[PDB]
């Protein structure tokens, strides 16, 4: 909020104004009308300039923080302030060693890296890394309970948590029928409300 008044180096302007006022007083003590008019005009001009500079500084706010997507500019050359860590030896590493274009990306993911979800999400609180790359439901849940960090960004690399069954197994169809009839009959929404999302946040 409006607190960086001294950060704008207003001390130098204040000192210059004080010195000029002292000089004007000395000159008037030592013609006075012209000097007084000059001082008044200088004060008005300085007021206008200070107001303009304050407005310009207020315009700048360092916006466009957080993140937008996976193809957004920041995620194509990490300098040193976006060291984002995957969770090496997962499916995620495999998926970053088989998408050719992402090569440079992958390189820096093989810099500082973790060996468990727990220490990772803790380090997000430890304020070193500024990102994380790991699947969806776990993330939204973790964001819910430990109401410290909000999910963001879009989705990519879609998929579906099916129910697996042996090839041409005797129930190859009936489970499909039931899952559809449920999946439209307002069941998954009920279960999702009761288990996957919370409201402490």
């Amino acid at each position: 909020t409006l607190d960086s008044f001294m950060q704008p180096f207003q001390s130098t302007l204040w000192l210059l104004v004080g010195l000029s006022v002292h000089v004007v007083a000395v000159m008037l003590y030592l013609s006075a009308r012209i000097l007084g008019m000059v001082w008044a005009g200088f004060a008005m001009i300085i007021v206008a300039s200070y107001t303009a500079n304050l407005a310009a500084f207020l315009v700048v706010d360092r916006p466009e923080e957080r993140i937008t997507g996976i193809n957004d500019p920041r995620l194509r050359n990490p300098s040193d302030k976006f060291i984002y860590a995957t969770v090496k030896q997962s499916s995620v590493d495999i998926y970053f060693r088989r998408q050719v274009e992402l090569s440079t990306m992958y390189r820096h993911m093989e810099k500082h890296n973790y060996e468990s979800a727990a220490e990772a999400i803790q380090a997000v609180r430890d304020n070193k890394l500024h990102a994380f790359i790991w699947d969806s439901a776990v993330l939204e849940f973790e964001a819910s309970q430990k109401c410290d960090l909000v999910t963001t960004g879009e989705l990519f690399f879609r998929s579906g948590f099916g129910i697996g069954m042996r090839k041409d197994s005797p129930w190859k169809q009936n489970v499909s029928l039931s899952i559809l009839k449920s999946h439209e009959n307002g069941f998954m929404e009920d279960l999702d409300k009761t288990w996957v999302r919370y409201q402490e946040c």
Binding site: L16, S20, L30, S31, L35, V38
Partner: peptide, 30 residues
């Protein structure tokens, strides 16, 4: 350019004050 403008204004004010003082001194005996 704010510092430059401020310095220019200060220089102009100093020159004007000096010229006014000189003119007042000259007209005091005139």
């Amino acid at each position: 350019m704010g510092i430059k403008h401020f310095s220019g204004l200060f220089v102009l004010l100093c020159i004007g004050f000096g010229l006014s003082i000189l003119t007042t001194i000259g007209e005091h005996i005139v």
